[PDB]
Amino acid sequence: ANPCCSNPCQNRGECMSTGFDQYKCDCTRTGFYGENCTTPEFLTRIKLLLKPTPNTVHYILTHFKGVWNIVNNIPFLRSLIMKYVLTSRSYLIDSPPTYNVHYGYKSWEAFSNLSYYTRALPPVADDCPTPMGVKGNKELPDSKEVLEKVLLRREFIPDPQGSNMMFAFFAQHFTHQFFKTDHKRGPGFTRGLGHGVDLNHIYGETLDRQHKLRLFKDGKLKYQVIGGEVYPPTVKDTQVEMIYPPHIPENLQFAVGQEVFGLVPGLMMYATIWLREHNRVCDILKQEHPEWGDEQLFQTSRLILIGETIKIVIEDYVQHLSGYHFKLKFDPELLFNQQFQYQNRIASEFNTLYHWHPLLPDTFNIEDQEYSFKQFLYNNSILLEHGLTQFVESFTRQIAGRVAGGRNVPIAVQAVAKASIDQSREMKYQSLNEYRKRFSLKPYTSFEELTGEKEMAAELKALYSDIDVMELYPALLVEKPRPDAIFGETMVELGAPFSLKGLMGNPICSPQYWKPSTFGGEVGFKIINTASIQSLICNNVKGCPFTSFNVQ
Amino acid sequence: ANPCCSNPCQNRGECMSTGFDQYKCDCTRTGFYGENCTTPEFLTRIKLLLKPTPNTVHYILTHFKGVWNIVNNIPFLRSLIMKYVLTSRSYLIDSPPTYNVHYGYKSWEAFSNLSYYTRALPPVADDCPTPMGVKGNKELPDSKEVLEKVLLRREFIPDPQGSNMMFAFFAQHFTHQFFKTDHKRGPGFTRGLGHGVDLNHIYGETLDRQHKLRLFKDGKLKYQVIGGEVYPPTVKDTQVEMIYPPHIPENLQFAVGQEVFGLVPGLMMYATIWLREHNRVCDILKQEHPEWGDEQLFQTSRLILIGETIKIVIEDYVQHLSGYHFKLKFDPELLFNQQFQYQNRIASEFNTLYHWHPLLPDTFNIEDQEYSFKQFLYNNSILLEHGLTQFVESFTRQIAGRVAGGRNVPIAVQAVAKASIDQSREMKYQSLNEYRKRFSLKPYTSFEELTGEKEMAAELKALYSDIDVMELYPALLVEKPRPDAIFGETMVELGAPFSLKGLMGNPICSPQYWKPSTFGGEVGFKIINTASIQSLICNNVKGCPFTSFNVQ
Numbered sequence A, B: 001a002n003p004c005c006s007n008p009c010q011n012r013g014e015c016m017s018t019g020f021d022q023y024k025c026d027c028t029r030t031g032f033y034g035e036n037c038t039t040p041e042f043l044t045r046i047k048l049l050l051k052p053t054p055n056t057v058h059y060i061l062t063h064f065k066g067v068w069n070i071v072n073n074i075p076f077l078r079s080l081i082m083k084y085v086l087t088s089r090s091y092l093i094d095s096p097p098t099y100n101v102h103y104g105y106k107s108w109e110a111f112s113n114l115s116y117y118t119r120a121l122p123p124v125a126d127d128c129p130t131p132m133g134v135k136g137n138k139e140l141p142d143s144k145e146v147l148e149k150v151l152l153r154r155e156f157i158p159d160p161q162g163s164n165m166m167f168a169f170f171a172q173h174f175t176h177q178f179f180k181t182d183h184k185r186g187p188g189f190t191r192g193l194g195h196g197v198d199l200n201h202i203y204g205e206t207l208d209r210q211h212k213l214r215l216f217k218d219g220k221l222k223y224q225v226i227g228g229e230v231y232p233p234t235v236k237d238t239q240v241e242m243i244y245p246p247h248i249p250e251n252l253q254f255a256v257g258q259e260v261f262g263l264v265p266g267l268m269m270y271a272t273i274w275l276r277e278h279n280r281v282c283d284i285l286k287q288e289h290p291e292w293g294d295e296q297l298f299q300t301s302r303l304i305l306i307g308e309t310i311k312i313v314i315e316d317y318v319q320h321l322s323g324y325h326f327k328l329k330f331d332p333e334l335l336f337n338q339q340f341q342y343q344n345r346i347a348s349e350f351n352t353l354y355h356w357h358p359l360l361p362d363t364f365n366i367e368d369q370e371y372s373f374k375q376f377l378y379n380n381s382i383l384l385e386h387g388l389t390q391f392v393e394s395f396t397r398q399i400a401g402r403v404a405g406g407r408n409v410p411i412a413v414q415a416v417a418k419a420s421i422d423q424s425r426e427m428k429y430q431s432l433n434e435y436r437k438r439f440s441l442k443p444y445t446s447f448e449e450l451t452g453e454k455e456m457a458a459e460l461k462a463l464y465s466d467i468d469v470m471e472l473y474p475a476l477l478v479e480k481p482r483p484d485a486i487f488g489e490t491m492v493e494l495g496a497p498f499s500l501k502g503l504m505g506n507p508i509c510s511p512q513y514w515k516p517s518t519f520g521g522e523v524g525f526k527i528i529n530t531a532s533i534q535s536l537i538c539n540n541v542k543g544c545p546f547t548s549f550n551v552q
């Protein structure tokens, strides 16, 4: 019935119903006019001709290694380039946020209710004749069919970028501070009211939990020593609620910021590394500030670890993902004479696109052992058995799986992949191509253009019939990868903007925050500005083991 | 104890303790350097010489009536001027917010905890030797003494700007959506988690309350008809919690967004006017959108009333307060090519400075009657007795009191003035002069310079001894007023920045919001862009009585 069910309005024009059968597009500031915001304004046509495609730009970022080598060493050029990578993307994210699972038009409820993931594209109205709007059949294809036919791994396909398990677990650990779906309410709701990098996964969402996690001397987090090694405290000692299956002995129930982290030893590894890091920074701060009390030492340390986390993500993590020869930089100052909103809201689609389960291997290989999924999950002995050092050495060596290119979701975790499909539909996601369009990408004209091959395309075609009805999530995992890259174009172009907004939108990047005293002086500031995945592990793991995000 | 107690750092440098007895100032981006951020940089000296004082600028805004008359009629000049008034102030507010009652240094707790009023200046550390830091005596003067000596009204001093009761009650009504101190926690905490103009005082803080207040047809708010006139529903019909003394009969317990509004008939007057307005905009929207359901009609109407509210406040309310000959304009577009944070956090100091109780008259005069405080409070009969029309006519005629200039707090309300003093101290406010310095104002060098007279100055001197120990709140009510103005310099210069930030920071002012479809089309948009205090009363109060914020 809804006359906007067709997504009539293009180039970001907003569709509004003007009577039961008519509609109108608001093209304000889109750069286009006409009934459907498809006729470009003169100034808009220039831009549309002087605008390289993302695939061109990526090509330039991943070639001319010699030229980038020179740029990387001219601080003022490096700054000019990073500033461009930061700002070019800004315009792709609504901020303040707009829509959510229940609101396809702006409302105060949508803006003000922090429990919702926000939405880059509004849901398909409940009374549209098809799931994707007006196109396709009354129902989407059997999710199980799509799962089995183009998603499930036959043979393990390694990531050509050499991503490793140190990377896979870092992504899970880091992303799981802001992806915390509140399943009691539904898939489109969140328990991460911080809506960003606040390290609630170390310190807790709520003051109540934070306080159980704290030692209240020297600003430190409680911890225990086992075989001379530092580890998170126990549930028994802290009373913080954790999710453990009943058969887990009280002494193995580790308490950390995030209630789910006890479930995977990879998580607990990072949880332990970051716990050590926080207490480490405390000793540094106390040294500088014998006048300081427990609160200030604690809060300052937290501010510093937020900085470290943003640094490592941009300069090591995204760096490695990108494959860029240009050396990415974490420098808030680059946005200071620029228009930018220091605020963020986690988008449902960001969450969805970030279900990188293909990363996971068939077995988890530590030292001599090869642990099956069954053996690895909820088994922290494995951690105590080998220790952090051996975990880091091992995970640095084991290659992670390719995410795009299709057929690489481990069977052990198929239920999670099916849910990703089913819950997308539940949330009334628009189609792959609508999302491509929304991110300034050219719609795919056939399934074969999407996959870059024939077999999976043919299966997808038989299932969906029309490319314009293809779904975002599966498309992501099935897409033709960039050359020797871990992802396809859609993943990158949707992901980068959400990612940089959540990184740079954090308040410590704001002018009033981004200064030495915020972090307890120049020595605190330097911890942030010199932080790296290597130092993090080096400072906190015994024998300062070498690590990196790819199998060297 | 704390080295930072004396407030050593100037020009917005941050004080940090470097050892028990030393300190350091972070002057990053202040424009000054040196141990105390007092030595200006070359570029800073130019600015400091080409910068007119606020008292000069005010003079220019309130004279040359002929010139402003021309500027007000050249749309592009009017736009250039308002843009300057908007932006000149921006730099005075920390956004993202920084400090609060418990945090004198930035922390994630301070930033993230939405229950706190933020702070424009950090509290005085708990272990400073004096209340103001290092200056003054171990305790401030008897708050009662200050109350009685320079705050209590002998004779009613009328506002020379001719502010009236329609104005007084509008400020109470409007401000009381974002000033809602949570007294269970303490004076530095708020129940207004919207931290701005969200009209929760009409619609409720929580979804639960909103829903009890709503009719669920045509997007309307419940209401009742009494003697052919429309009024808010009752507590018995709705179950919404209100604050009424026990002797109030169930049929007089009106339910509205803000639990406290039943306490003053002036509040209930506006509460009724805005309730009517909301249902009025619903009829308009249904007419335009017969396709629309109850939710969308309700939410859109709310978006529109937010807009109307921001419009009226800038173009009528602040207009009248300012005394400016320049015609202020509500135009979000003026900030679109500008650096600005669409976000806000209510400052404790804003709350404090807005305790405009001197506005209140000795009696409330409606038609023939002269009601005492005792008779007026919690008495909604008075409203049903005379009706809205007669209330508007009467309150348009009755002059309000002058706020600055001293000795004008009605005795009936002395307890509230004392609390304002006591709770300031409880929250560890810095001194008047610290706050002056913080808003780029020149410290007062004597009490006589503050009051502009001798008698109240002498009393204040005998009480405080040192001008540099004088307190913000009393100073506000006692200050020498601008010429024939309602306020003194300190009130204006502190007040204006907080005020404009809360008005313009609202998301509907953000580019992705400020467009017709957000408000259900050009007809909804036009309601916002033509709204005025007069159109509000006229479309909603029988007889379309003439109203205004000032006495005729």
Ligand code: HEM
Residues within 6 Å of the ligand: A168, A169, A171, A172, A173, A175, A179, A180, A181, A260, A264, A266, A351, A354, A355, A356, A357, A359, A360, A377, A413, A416
């Ligand atoms: C290591 C073994 C893993 C298992 C057994 C697993 C399984 C699951 C399960 C059951 C969920 C939904 C429940 C939850 O919140 O935890 C989930 C969600 C998710 N997974 Fe994983 N996963 C694993 C690793 C990873 C990795 C490496 C990533 C890469 C970032 C990842 C990304 C995500 C994301 C972003 C969600 C959504 C979380 C939420 O909405 O709360 N997972 N996975």
Ligand code: HEM
Residues within 6 Å of the ligand: B168, B169, B171, B172, B175, B179, B180, B181, B183, B264, B266, B351, B354, B355, B356, B357, B359, B360, B377, B413, B416
């Ligand atoms: C109409 C008769 C009025 C009465 C009986 C009254 C009384 C009070 C009382 C008892 C309080 C503190 C009570 C509490 O917060 O629990 C208060 C606070 C306050 N008053 Fe008034 N007042 C009146 C009018 C006004 C007006 C015209 C203004 C002008 C703006 C005003 C400004 C304020 C403000 C800003 C607060 C702070 C409340 C908060 O922090 O949440 N009042 N008033």
Ligand SMILES: *[C@@H]1O[C@H](CO)[C@@H](O[C@@H]2O[C@H](CO)[C@@H](O[C@@H]3O[C@H](CO)[C@@H](O)[C@H](O)[C@H]3NC(C)=O)[C@H](O)[C@H]2NC(C)=O)[C@H](O)[C@H]1NC(C)=O
Residues within 6 Å of the ligand: A113, A114, A115, A116, A184, A185, A186, B206, B207, B208
């Ligand atoms: C963010 O949006 C959420 C979804 O709208 C809100 O969650 C919903 O709030 C309601 C309570 O405020 C619940 O509705 C039910 O309403 C009936 C009416 O009479 C009550 O009796 C019920 O007790 C109440 N709940 C139950 C158990 O039936 C919704 O169930 C509730 N949850 C969901 C997922 O819809 C959030 O409240 C909102 N957040 C904020 C801060 O307002």
Ligand SMILES: *[C@@H]1O[C@H](CO)[C@@H](O[C@@H]2O[C@H](CO)[C@@H](O[C@@H]3O[C@H](CO)[C@@H](O)[C@H](O)[C@H]3NC(C)=O)[C@H](O)[C@H]2NC(C)=O)[C@H](O)[C@H]1NC(C)=O
Residues within 6 Å of the ligand: A206, A207, A208, B113, B114, B115, B116, B184, B185, B186
């Ligand atoms: C914003 O900051 C507020 C002020 O710190 C927080 O409010 C405080 O949270 C505490 C709950 O975590 C309460 O403290 C008490 O702690 C002991 C622990 O052993 C409990 O037994 C007590 O029952 C608990 N309070 C009670 C009911 O006695 C504080 O009372 C509470 N309020 C104040 C004024 O401090 C807010 O929690 C915080 N907001 C967020 C979102 O974290």
Ligand SMILES: Cc1ccc(-c2cc(C(F)(F)F)nn2-c2ccc(S(N)(=O)=O)cc2)cc1
Residues within 6 Å of the ligand: A058, A085, A318, A321, A322, A323, A328, A354, A482, A485, A486, A487, A488, A491, A492, A493, A494, A495, A496, A499, A500
């Ligand atoms: C979820 C997500 C997706 C992308 C990014 C990201 C950000 C950036 C940058 F440079 F803008 F910072 N690049 N970049 C990126 C670029 C290219 C690839 S690739 N090698 O798969 O084509 C992979 C990642 C980050 C997070």
Ligand SMILES: Cc1ccc(-c2cc(C(F)(F)F)nn2-c2ccc(S(N)(=O)=O)cc2)cc1
Residues within 6 Å of the ligand: B058, B085, B318, B321, B322, B323, B328, B354, B482, B485, B486, B487, B488, B491, B492, B493, B494, B495, B496, B499, B500
């Ligand atoms: C609480 C508060 C305080 C000041 C203002 C304000 C804002 C503005 C402006 F500039 F933005 F338009 N002026 N302006 C203002 C200016 C001058 C006076 S006056 N007649 O007392 O000197 C009174 C008010 C608003 C709210």
Ligand SMILES: CCCCCCCCO[C@@H]1O[C@H](CO)[C@@H](O)[C@H](O)[C@H]1O
Residues within 6 Å of the ligand: B148, B149, B152, B153, B154, B155, B411, B414
């Ligand atoms: C209204 C005309 C008199 C005002 C000036 C009074 C100076 C302060 O006088 C005070 O008056 C208070 C209010 O009645 C009383 O509660 C106190 O006992 C008294 O000290």
Ligand SMILES: *[C@@H]1O[C@H](CO)[C@@H](O)[C@H](O)[C@H]1NC(C)=O
Residues within 6 Å of the ligand: A006, A007, A008, A035, A036
């Ligand atoms: C917009 O395209 C044209 C108007 O130029 C119109 O025929 C069409 O109906 C509109 N879009 C859709 C989906 O039909």
Ligand SMILES: *[C@@H]1O[C@H](CO)[C@@H](O)[C@H](O)[C@H]1NC(C)=O
Residues within 6 Å of the ligand: A374, A375, A376, A379, A381, A382, A385
């Ligand atoms: C957990 O790991 C331990 C130690 O390596 C192993 O012996 C045990 O079998 C594992 N338990 C499960 C249920 O996999």
Ligand SMILES: *[C@@H]1O[C@H](CO)[C@@H](O)[C@H](O)[C@H]1NC(C)=O
Residues within 6 Å of the ligand: B006, B008, B035, B036
């Ligand atoms: C800052 O002012 C000067 C340093 O230039 C010095 O006299 C003074 O003591 C410093 N701080 C204080 C406490 O005034």
Ligand SMILES: *[C@@H]1O[C@H](CO)[C@@H](O)[C@H](O)[C@H]1NC(C)=O
Residues within 6 Å of the ligand: B374, B375, B376, B379, B381, B382, B385
């Ligand atoms: C309330 O007002 C009514 C009529 O306006 C008046 O007669 C009555 O005395 C007042 N009641 C109180 C409680 O003062």
